[PDB]
């Protein structure tokens, strides 16, 4: 079984630099 | 950090940068090396406000965030005359033609 990347599915976050 | 500026007088525009902590006086020094005029014969402006020799560029309102490489802050420049007053005058650049239809 080849494990591919996946997204945890959480709340994205703003980068304060912006 | 560093502030990026456009020092302008008439049809002349000097592109340069300086430390936000450096002074108006030191900036005048930079101008002198280029246009051969002493600091006491120079008038530098942020819009219509004459900049005092002793203030740092940061204290004049020139910050890294307001004067960036891709969009430098404009510093107005006028020279002193023996018995006459030279009004601050920055000649406007040209204007582009109409945006072509296929780009609208």
């Amino acid at each position: 079984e080849m494990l591919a990347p996946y997204i945890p599915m959480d709340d994205d976050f703003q980068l304060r630099s912006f | 950090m560093d502030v990026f500026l456009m020092i302008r007088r008439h049809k002349t525009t000097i592109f340069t940068d300086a430390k936000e902590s450096s002074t108006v006086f030191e900036l005048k020094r930079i101008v002198e090396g280029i246009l051969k005029r002493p600091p006491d014969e120079q008038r530098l402006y942020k819009d219509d406000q004459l900049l005092d020799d002793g203030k740092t560029l940061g204290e004049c309102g020139f910050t890294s965030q307001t004067a960036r490489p891709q969009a430098p802050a404009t510093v107005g420049l006028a020279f002193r005359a023996d018995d006459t007053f030279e009004a601050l005058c920055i000649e406007p650049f040209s204007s582009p033609p109409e945006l072509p239809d296929v780009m609208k």
């Binding site: 959480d10 980068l15 912006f18 | 296929v102």
Partner: protein, 150 residues
Amino acid sequence: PVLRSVNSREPSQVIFCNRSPRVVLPVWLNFDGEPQPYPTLPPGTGRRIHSYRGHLWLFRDAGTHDGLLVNQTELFVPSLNVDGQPIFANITLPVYTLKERCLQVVRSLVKPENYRRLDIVRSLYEDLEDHPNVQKDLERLTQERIAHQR
């Protein structure tokens, strides 16, 4: 294929940080070295990712595929997390040549079928038509890879 992820099966927690003004498209090169797209990142946003040690990632402008950098380079490779410490992939714009930047703006305003109605020197029509392509990039990075391995 020299450029491809390794099926390590060793989890690596990564955090994509879109520190660019573009909508970012993270591209994962699978085990056969084939480009696979993932959920895009809005400008100035970050997102947690469960990837694996030895996997390859590259990033492009989602709508134009203009090239982007990750931690200042072309490719990003997750490593094992050191003390629950997440691995950061800081996506930023590269310093495009003035010409490429102008080409981007023009392409974003004029439909391809109209490029040639523009009043510019001939040669530039081809430069406009030759828009960024991930496949071509891989071939280029591949040969660049081969040179750096004498």
